Amino acid sequence: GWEVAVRPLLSASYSAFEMKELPQLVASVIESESEILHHEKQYEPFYSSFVALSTHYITTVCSLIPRNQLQSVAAACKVLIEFSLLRLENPDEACAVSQKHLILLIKGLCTGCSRLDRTEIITFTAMMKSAKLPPELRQKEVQMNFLNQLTSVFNPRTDQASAIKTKNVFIAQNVASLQELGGSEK
Amino acid sequence: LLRVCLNLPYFLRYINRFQDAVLANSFFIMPATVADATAVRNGFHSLVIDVTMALDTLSLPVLEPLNPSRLQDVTVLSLSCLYAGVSVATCMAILHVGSKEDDYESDAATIVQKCLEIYDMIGQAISSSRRAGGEHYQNFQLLGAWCLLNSLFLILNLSPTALADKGAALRVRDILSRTGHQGFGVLSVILANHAIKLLTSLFQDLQVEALHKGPPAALSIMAQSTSIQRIQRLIDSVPLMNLLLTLLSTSYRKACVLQRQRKGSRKDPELFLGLASNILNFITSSMLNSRNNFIRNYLSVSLSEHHMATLASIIKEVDKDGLKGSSDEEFAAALYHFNHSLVTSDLQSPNLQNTLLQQLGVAPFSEGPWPLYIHPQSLSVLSRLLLIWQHKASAQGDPDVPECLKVWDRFLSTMKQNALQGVVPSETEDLNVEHLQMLLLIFHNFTETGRRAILSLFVQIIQELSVNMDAQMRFVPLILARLLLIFDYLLHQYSKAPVYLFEQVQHNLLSPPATTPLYHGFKEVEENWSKHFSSDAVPHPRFYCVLSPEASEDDLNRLDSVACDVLFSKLVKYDELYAALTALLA
Amino acid sequence: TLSLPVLEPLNPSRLQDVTVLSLSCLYAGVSVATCMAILHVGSKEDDYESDAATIVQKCLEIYDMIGQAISSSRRAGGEHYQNFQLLGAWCLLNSLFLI
Secondary structure, three states, rough: OOHHHHHHHHHHHHHOOOOOHHHHHHHHHHOOHHHHHHOHHEEEHHHHHHHHHHHHHHHOOOOOOHHHHHHHHHHHHHHHHHOOOOOOHHHOOOOOOOOHHHHHHHHHOOOOOOOOOHHHHHHHHHHOOOOOOOOHHHHHHHHHHHHHHOOOOOOOOOOOOHHHHHHHHHHHHHHHHHHOOOOOOO | HHHHHHHHHHHHHHHHHHHHHHHHHHHOOOOOHHHHHHHHHHHHHHHHHHHHHHHHHHHHHOOOOOOHHHHHHHHHHHHHHHHHHHHHHHHHHHHHHOOOHHHHHHHHHHHHHHHHHHHHHHHHHOOOOOOOOOOOHHHHHHHHHHHHHHHHHHHHOOOHHHHHHOOOOOOOHHHHHHHOOOOHHHHHHHHHHHHHHHHHHHHHHHHOOOOOOOOOOOOOOOOOOHHHHHHHHHHHHOHHHHHHHHHHHHHHHHHHHHHHHHHOOOOOHHHHHHHHHHHHHHHHHHOOOOOOOOHHHHHHOOOOOHHHHHHHHHHHHHOOOOOOOOOHHHHHHHHHHHHHHHHHHOOOHHHHHHHHHHOOOOEEEEEEEHOOOOHHHHHHHHHHHHHHHHHHHHHHHOOHHHHHHHHHHHHHHHHHHHHHHHOOOOOOOOOHHHHHHHHHHHHHHHHHHHHHHHHHHHHHHHHHOOOOOOHHOOOOEEEHHHHHHHHHHHHHHOOOOOOOHHHHHHHOOOOOOOOOOOEOOOOOOOHHHHOOOOOOOOOOOOOOOOOOOOOOOOOOOOOHHHHHHOOOOOOOHHHHHHHHHHHOOO | OOOOOOOOOOOOHHHHHHHEEEEEEHHHHHHHHHHHHHHHHHHHHHHHHHHHHHHHHHHHHHHHHHHHHHEEEOOOOOOOHHHHHHHHHHHHHHHHHOO
């Protein structure tokens, strides 16, 4: 199953991210959160490249995300920022991402747009092509995200304009997630 | 100029009073008596002159070196006009509860407005200065809030009864220690709005500062205090939660009054609505969403069944308003936002949750008939609470939530009563689609035992309704039709829950008041309905479907295999039930 | 990182570190500028020149950012902001004298 996620990773790599496949990667990240967190250095490169590409693509569609699917995007982004800050705090040799690039990925999850250059994006795609990884299920994931929404109340206190407003809401959410982790201090 | 301003003839009075007040936060106002207020009114004109003078004097470059010595004096002048304005508002409320007139009202309004402006200039000057611009700004904001909150509380607490009883210092402590809400007006709104602003800032300060980083902060700009201490000070001086809710309720109710007047002081309900909406937002964000333990603890303690009842009342008022309007819509959405926050927040006790549910009339353990139609927020809130309860149990694999089980049982009993009576219900007396959707969702979360019991009860109800054919043959089956639709859904969707159902609830009830709810409908039946129905739009979905436009499938395995298994189990007498269904056709 | 809300909490303890980092580039930049001055007096080289120019530019930029942060903060500013300005001016003047 690790295979299909690299699909939205590569299908979108070709011609921008398909919002349609997005609700898939969000799911993936949250499901693999604990693993990205305490994984083995054997698949460090794989996990690191996964996180970087996921962050970049989620930022690329920051302004355009279903308002209903917007909350799951914020959950997956909190997971990604967790991995990024963990790495920036404990520099790892097996990590396939530079501290500059990791700081820039947090900056993009927390700012208007991502900045990772395409040359570096293809480098990440190659470190992912490394494949150095460790229906009914779709409906199960749907019910999981449904409980997620019940617990995750939007509380969003304070067309094209709405798209920019959705983008700013995502930005506020991820800034909160970074501060949630006291990452500012870290 | 500073000396001249601080040496104003009318200012000196309030200045001294405010200083006395700063000691032991003994907030007091002298126009408590109507006659006292009248005398205050008499002096309005010269008071207006002095206020304007001080305002313009501070407007031109002054107190450039905000050295602590000047900083202190300038803050004093600002808080002094603040107290003057709050006392003017208090005397206006006193005259109102007792009841050049407009001239005096004009003077008073001018005084309050200009007074708040002096405060804001002094505040902006402090915040924009290089000598004392930050912690001093924060303590200036505390002093201001404190004054505003105390005044608002006092004004609201002023009742004509107490007024005539007195018939001079308006000690807030006395009212609290001793412990209609009249006296709230445009001026009250103005002060409340400014007070809300100050409150928001100190709470944002709390949030940025480490969670749960002592004594009540001291009422001094120079005094260095923790943000928590400042908030602690405000709470200790006056009950933050109580005052906020009091203002909220009064504002909303007053707005409604103005609306009614229009249907038949500013007469703009929007004004009060705006204040009310702001209050909701502040509490939800600064408090409800606040992760600070101190804040949450205070909230939980402050929360009372009375508050729940008030909240329920407002919800019902908004839900039963029937007028979207403009600002009303914003307030309505904010209301729901607050309601859902309460439902999700652990601050609301289970006791408080049940209290709110009963006050709405949607208590899941109440007696009588189940409300078939539930109001847009009364339904959304109920659904949120029940679903969160089912999730708690599901998270720990706990047994079927009895409340939701009792919900379904009561609902089915009411439906059988309606079908036994076969009386056509009104739209307000007919089960709403979104309600049906959340009920099916709850039925799913239930374990085999719960869902099988529901199926058996449905079979028994249909069989009993078939016992009297003559009445059924001459009774409108609108409710029986709804029951049969529910049973049919529970035939193609019993073992599993459909993705559309989740989306419908997430879109209809997990949303503040697309406005159109998400659901399916009887194409031919809805066509005939339109043949003789309102032309504007479809106000209420009397005819609908929950089975979805499922691909046409022959009876072969049309009914769920699990559902088939249950029907032939000892619990369900299918052979006898099927005969009743055949008879029901008549 | 500085573009992020990393130094946003100007807590007294953080305030010290926030000032520390700011004047740190200030010193780094003034020293890089002094090195460029030594090179000019002695006179991929163009590449290194551009590198040092970018360094000094971002040095001043970080100084300005932390300054405005301490100025508009509700937990710092006034004399604190004035003293940050004083220290920055000291560093810059001493650098000018040395170069």
